[PDB]
Copies of this chain bind each other. A is one copy, B any other.
Amino acid sequence: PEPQMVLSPLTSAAIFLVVTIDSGGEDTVRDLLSDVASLERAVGFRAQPDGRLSCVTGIGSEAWDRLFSGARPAGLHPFRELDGPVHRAVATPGDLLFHIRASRLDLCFALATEIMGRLRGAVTPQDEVHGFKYFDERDMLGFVDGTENPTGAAARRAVLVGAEDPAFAGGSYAVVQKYLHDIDAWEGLSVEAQERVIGRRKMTDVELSDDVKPADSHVALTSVTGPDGSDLEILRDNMPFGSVGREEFGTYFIGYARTPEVTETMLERMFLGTASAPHDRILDFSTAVTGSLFFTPAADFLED
């Protein structure tokens, strides 16, 4: 089975499009899904090899039942709201995700235009975010973002559905959350205090030693070990976005994994806390305003 381009090369621009399917829009949606790979080639081919254009398409739990009969992916369910003592992860509506990436925003925009052109009248937009990465892979908090992502074979094993759900092998599960940051509060911390929040050095991106790293730092809470002592990993492609005039400074979080359990365990640790940590300290500077879960099928499933 041929996967979608979940494992993409590094890209400096992205568009995230989340829509809901209107009553009676099902047929139009199914037609577009069968064409989205051809649209990706049409927009991208003439800008190769620098364009690096890809589109990953996902389908929500409620939408799946409206579009398809027969088997469901084993782990597909609606995003679960988490109501912590201090911080909340909200659930927001979304039936379809288009995660569009390239080396330039114009290519993302051209593909997004063709997709939405085909769906007009059949869907309602819920969210549209145009992301850009800083030139040294830093996010809006000023930390390098992506460093511990798995690569090569380890990435395939962490991200792609396999023999545990063989009809849907080559798929993946995506969790998205849009975060807005309190930059005034963040810039009031010393650099060393910021390092204790994240769990890595700011300028050099070296992980703090185990003797200094706080238990409520972001890296400590999002490190999870499996039954056998292996690291359970996800693949992230977080993107900054925002608007200077409205004072909106954001991180758009997207995490891919072979089962949603990994990502959801990380989120529970962050928002509900553990015995040793009240919550993830990154959340004292970051508010989640969307939350959705999608299954991203193998490419050949869509081509039918």
Chain A residues with CB under 8 Å of chain B are: 2, 9-10, 12-13, 15, 17, 19, 38-39, 41-43, 45-49, 51, 104-107, 109-110, 112-116, 120, 125, 128, 130, 132-138, 142, 144, 146-148, 152-154, 190-192, 200, 202-207, 240, 242-247, 249
Contacts and interface: CB of A to CB of B under 8 A. Distances in A.
Contacts of A10: 48-49
A132 B104 contact: yes
Contacts of A114: 204, 206
Given A10-B49, A205-B46, A206-B114, A106 B128 contact: no
Copies of this chain assembled into the complex: 6
Contacts of A19: 245
A96 to B, nearest CB: 12
A100 to B, nearest CB: 10
A132 B153 contact: no
A244 B17 contact: yes
Contacts of A245: 17, 19, 116, 125, 128
A132 B9 CA distance: 22
B132 A109 contact: yes
Please indicate which of the listed interface residues A15, A110, A142, A245 has the most CB atoms of chain B within 10 Å of its own CB: A245
Please indicate which of the listed interface residues A106, A133, A202 has the most CB atoms of chain B within 10 Å of its own CB: A106
A195 to B, nearest CB: 9
A137 B133 CA distance: 19
B45 A137 contact: yes
A192 B216 CA distance: 24
B125 A106 contact: no
Contact of A109 (B42, B43, B244): B244
